[PDB]
């Protein structure tokens, strides 16, 4: 299972050195990137390959109640550089993510218009796809969470991770 090292270490918050009255981690701290998606049956773990009949993207919402429900992370405004590491010596042949968007006309077909795409990486060659680190902005006049969308595709296996995880974006 890979991580998130940057922008900053969720350890920190996950000792009870920062509250212990108050604390905020669960054992759903061990793989919030490195959830594990296979191809057909079992699921075994949430509603996923479900993005063409949305039973998955309307499925996200109750997600947001969920027992599993990850550990949402505010982040304020400005400009902020997100690096992720894997502990995985297998290959990768793409990686890619996008971010959800409340607030679409119901004119608007939901199953497009409640998620966006912000960045797409394929792992080919030189320098340029050997960035694992990339650069994102935070808006500094808006308020609001949402829910990013990423997989991470391992080429030495038909099976890969996907993987959802809430921040909450604030102004600064």
């Not at 505010?74 to 990686?95: C, D, K, L, R, V």
């Not at 994102?136 to 959802?164: C, K, M, S």
């Amino acid at each position: 299972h890979g991580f998130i090292e940057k922008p900053g270490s969720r350890a920190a918050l996950c000792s009870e050195a920062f509250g212990f009255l108050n604390l905020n981690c669960g054992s759903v701290m061990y793989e919030p990137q490195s959830l594990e998606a296979k191809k057909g049956f079992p699921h075994s773990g949430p509603a996923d390959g479900q993005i063409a009949s949305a039973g998955g993207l309307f499925g996200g919402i109750l997600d947001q109640q969920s027992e599993n429900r990850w550990f949402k992370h505010i982040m304020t405004g400005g400009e902020h550089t997100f690096t992720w590491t894997y502990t995985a010596p297998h290959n990768t042949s793409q990686w890619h993510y996008y971010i959800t968007k409340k607030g679409w006309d119901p004119d608007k077909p939901l199953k497009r218009a409640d998620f966006e795409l912000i960045g797409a990486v394929p792992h080919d060659g030189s320098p340029a796809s050997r960035n694992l680190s990339h650069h994102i902005y935070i808006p500094e006049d808006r308020l609001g969470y949402h829910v990013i969308l990423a997989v991470w595709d391992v080429a030495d296996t038909e099976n890969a991770f996907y993987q959802v995880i809430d921040v909450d974006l604030v102004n600064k």
